[PDB]
Amino acid sequence: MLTKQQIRYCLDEMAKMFPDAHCELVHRNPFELLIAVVLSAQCTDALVNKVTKRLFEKYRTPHDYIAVPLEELEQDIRSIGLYRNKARNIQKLCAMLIDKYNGEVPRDRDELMKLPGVGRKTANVVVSVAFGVPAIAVDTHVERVSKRLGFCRWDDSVLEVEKTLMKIIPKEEWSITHHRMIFFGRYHCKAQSPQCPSCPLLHLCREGKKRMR
DNA sequence: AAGACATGGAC
DNA sequence: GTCCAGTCT
Ligand code: SF4
Ligand code: NA
């Protein structure tokens, strides 16, 4: 694992590589964001943005989602992988927003996690992007980057990774650092072919030096 | 607690 | 024809 100063050094670099890093899921409100991120699990944004382009046209409130037949909703998001579980989760989720949260998307992370289909990653994206609540959502990219760079150990769980970053990164920068890491991993330290040769971190990166050598 | 969920894009 | 883009029971 790198030293704290090194980690901050890696993050400060990513910041310069992707100064405009942001959430790339198209949404007009917290609710649209919630649905968008739920469909985003194990799927690409381009795909999700395409589907919600029409979905948010057909649905605009939770009453709209539970109004139609489950089979209908499934069809509406059929191109999304894991669409069956997602379609079902959305209906139970909307029902709960109505029954339990006065028909609104809760601003609490743990409260969001009670919603069917919502795990820690999803809840973290939502409170951060929609309500400015500092949080570090750990997805495939964040985890890969953290491990390749030696931010934490390869055996650490997503929670452990999240706790490592929170301990290092100042609460006031958790959100933006999260997006920078996403961008860094999505457009640079990719899973299939990382751009190590021209990376400003190879000089202190374990995965990068092994990749070259 | 591994296992099932699952379409679509990048090679 | 593989590999990659979280949650639940
Ligand atoms: S050196 Fe390679 S593996 Fe390390 S962070 Fe840069 S691109 Fe990722
Ligand atoms: Na949940």
Asked if A48 and A63 sit in the same domain, the reply is yes
Say if residues A109 and A134 touch (Cβ distance below 8 Å). no
Point out the domain boundary residue: A103, A133, A163.
Answer: A133
| Residue A121 designated active-site | yes
Of the listed ligands, the closest to the CA of A148 is 1
A129 and A165 co-located in one domain: no
CB count, 10 Å around CB of A79? Answer: 11
Q: Are residues A48 and A96 in the same domain?
A: yes
The residue written with tokens 């997602």 in the block is A86
Of A133, A155, A176, the position where a domain reaches its end is A133
Active-site annotation holds for A108: no
The last residue of one of the domains, among A79, A113, A133, is A133
Distance of alpha carbon A108 from alpha carbon A126, whole angstroms: 9
Q: Are residues A160 and A143 in the same domain?
A: yes
Of A176, A191, A209, nearest to A145 by C-alpha is: A191
Minimum CA–C1' distance nucleotide for A43: C5
Ligand nearest to the CA of A144: 1
Q: Locate the ligand 1 atom nearest the alpha carbon of residue A202 and give its number.
A: 1
What's CA A76's distance to the chain center, in Å?
Answer: 23
Which amino acid is located at A46 in the chain?
A
Structural domain total, chain A: 2
Nearest 10 degrees: Cα torsion A7, A144, A28, A33: -110
Q: How was this structure determined?
A: X-ray
Q: How many CA atoms lie within 13 A of A59 on its CB side?
A: 25
With CA of A37 and C1' of each nucleotide, the nearest comes out as: C6
SS (H, E, C) A23-86: CCCCCCCHHHHHHHHHHHCCCCHHHHHHHHHHHHHHCCCHHHHHHCCHHHHHHHCCCCCCHHHH
Contacts of A64 (CB under 8 A, 6+ apart): A58
Q: How far apart are the first and last CA of chain A?
A: 20
What are the residues whose beta carbons fall under 8 Å from the beta carbon of A30, sequence distance 6 or more? A104, A105, A126, A130, A131
CB-proximal positions of chain C, under 7 Å: 3-9
A37 and A125: one domain? yes
Length of chain A equals 213
- A8 in ligand 1 pocket by Cβ < 6 Å? no
Same domain, A209 and A194: yes
Does residue A123 sit in the same domain as residue A143? no
Q: What is the resolution of this structure in A?
A: 2.2
Residue A164's domain comprises 2-21+134-213
Question: Are A75 and A40 within 8 A, CB to CB?
Answer: no
Do A109 and A127 sit in the same domain of this protein?
yes
Q: Is A195 helix (H, G, I), strand (E, B) or coil?
A: coil
Q: Nearest residue to C2 (CA, C1')?
A: A192
Q: Residue A83 sits in a domain of what CATH number?
A: 1.10.340.30
Q: Is the CB of A74 under 6 A from ligand 1?
A: no
Torsion sign over Cα A48, A53, A57, A58: negative
Q: Which residue has the tokens 């706790």?
A: A163
Give the contacts of A38 (CB within 8 A, at least 6 positions apart). Answer: A86, A89, A90, A93, A117, A118, A122
Interatomic CA–C1' length for residue A5 and nucleotide B8, angstroms: 41
Nucleotides on chain B that have an atom closer than 7 A to a protein CB are 5-9, 11
Same domain, A129 and A45: yes
Nearest to A40 by CA among A147, A145, A119: A119
Q: Is A113 exposed, middle or buried (0-12, 13-18, 19+ CB in 10 A)?
A: middle
Query: Residues A150, A1: contact at Cβ < 8 Å?
Result: yes
Q: How far apart are CA A10 and CA A12, in angstroms?
A: 6
CATH of the domain at A213: 1.10.1670.10
CA of A21 to the centre of ligand 2 (A): 27
Name the DSSP class of A150: T
* No. of helices (H) and no. of strands (E), chain A: 12, 0
Question: Is residue A126 located within the same domain as residue A181?
Answer: no
Is the domain of A84 the same as that of A172?
Answer: no
Structure-derived torsion over alpha carbons of residues A45, A172, A97, A71, reported in degrees to the nearest 10: 10
